[PDB]
Protein backbone atom coordinates (compact mmCIF):
# COMPACT_ATOMS: atom_id res chain seq x y z
CA UNK A 1 0.00 0.00 0.00
CA UNK A 2 3.11 2.19 0.11
CA UNK A 3 3.19 2.61 -3.68
CA UNK A 4 -0.43 3.77 -4.05
CA UNK A 5 0.01 6.05 -1.03
CA UNK A 6 3.14 7.65 -2.50
CA UNK A 7 1.32 8.10 -5.83
CA UNK A 8 -1.64 9.72 -4.08
CA UNK A 9 0.72 11.96 -2.11
CA UNK A 10 2.40 12.96 -5.39
CA UNK A 11 -1.06 13.91 -6.62
CA UNK A 12 -1.78 15.63 -3.29
CA UNK A 13 1.23 17.91 -3.67
CA UNK A 14 -0.30 19.25 -6.88
CA UNK A 15 -3.81 19.07 -5.38
CA UNK A 16 -3.11 22.29 -3.39
CA UNK A 17 -5.79 21.66 -0.74
CA UNK A 18 3.16 12.13 4.05
CA UNK A 19 5.40 9.06 3.73
CA UNK A 20 8.99 8.71 4.92
CA UNK A 21 10.81 11.49 3.05
CA UNK A 22 14.22 11.68 4.78
CA UNK A 23 15.77 13.06 1.59
CA UNK A 24 12.59 13.13 -0.52
CA UNK A 25 11.22 16.16 1.34
CA UNK A 26 13.64 18.35 -0.64
CA UNK A 27 12.14 16.88 -3.82
CA UNK A 28 8.63 17.51 -2.53
CA UNK A 29 9.32 21.08 -1.45
CA UNK A 30 10.98 21.99 -4.76
CA UNK A 31 8.14 20.40 -6.74
CA UNK A 32 5.49 22.13 -4.59
CA UNK A 33 7.11 25.57 -4.78
CA UNK A 34 7.57 25.15 -8.53
CA UNK A 35 3.94 24.06 -8.94
CA UNK A 36 2.54 27.03 -7.04
Amino acid sequence: LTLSSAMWFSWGVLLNSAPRSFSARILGMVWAGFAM
Binding site: L1, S4, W8, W11, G12, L14, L15, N16, S17
Partner: protein
Protein backbone atom coordinates in the same frame (compact mmCIF):
# COMPACT_ATOMS: atom_id res chain seq x y z
CA UNK B 1 -16.65 5.52 10.61
CA UNK B 2 -17.56 9.17 11.15
CA UNK B 3 -17.90 10.71 7.67
CA UNK B 4 -21.36 9.45 6.70
CA UNK B 5 -22.91 12.86 6.09
CA UNK B 6 -19.71 14.75 6.94
CA UNK B 7 -18.51 14.29 3.35
CA UNK B 8 -21.00 17.07 2.50
CA UNK B 9 -19.23 19.54 4.79
CA UNK B 10 -15.88 18.08 3.67
CA UNK B 11 -16.40 18.87 -0.02
CA UNK B 12 -18.31 22.08 0.78
CA UNK B 13 -15.31 23.32 2.76
CA UNK B 14 -12.89 22.10 0.10
CA UNK B 15 -14.80 24.20 -2.45
CA UNK B 16 -12.53 27.06 -1.35
CA UNK B 17 -9.38 24.86 -1.27
CA UNK B 18 -8.93 25.02 2.54
CA UNK B 19 -10.90 23.00 5.09
CA UNK B 20 -10.47 20.52 7.94
CA UNK B 21 -8.74 17.43 6.46
CA UNK B 22 -10.60 14.17 6.98
CA UNK B 23 -8.76 11.04 5.81
CA UNK B 24 -9.81 10.15 2.28
CA UNK B 25 -10.43 6.44 1.59
CA UNK B 26 -8.12 4.01 -0.19
CA UNK B 27 -10.53 3.31 -3.05
CA UNK B 28 -8.82 5.80 -5.45
CA UNK B 29 -12.19 7.60 -5.74
CA UNK B 30 -12.51 10.55 -3.36
CA UNK B 31 -8.90 11.60 -3.94
CA UNK B 32 -9.29 11.74 -7.72
CA UNK B 33 -12.62 13.59 -7.66
CA UNK B 34 -11.30 16.06 -5.07
CA UNK B 35 -8.19 16.55 -7.24
CA UNK B 36 -10.37 17.38 -10.26
CA UNK B 37 -12.55 19.70 -8.18
CA UNK B 38 -9.45 21.32 -6.65
CA UNK B 39 -8.07 22.00 -10.13
CA UNK B 40 -11.44 23.55 -10.98
CA UNK B 41 -11.30 25.63 -7.80
CA UNK B 42 -7.82 26.87 -8.72
CA UNK B 43 -9.31 27.86 -12.08
CA UNK B 44 -12.17 29.57 -10.23
Amino acid sequence: SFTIGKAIWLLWGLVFNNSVPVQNPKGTTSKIMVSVWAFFAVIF
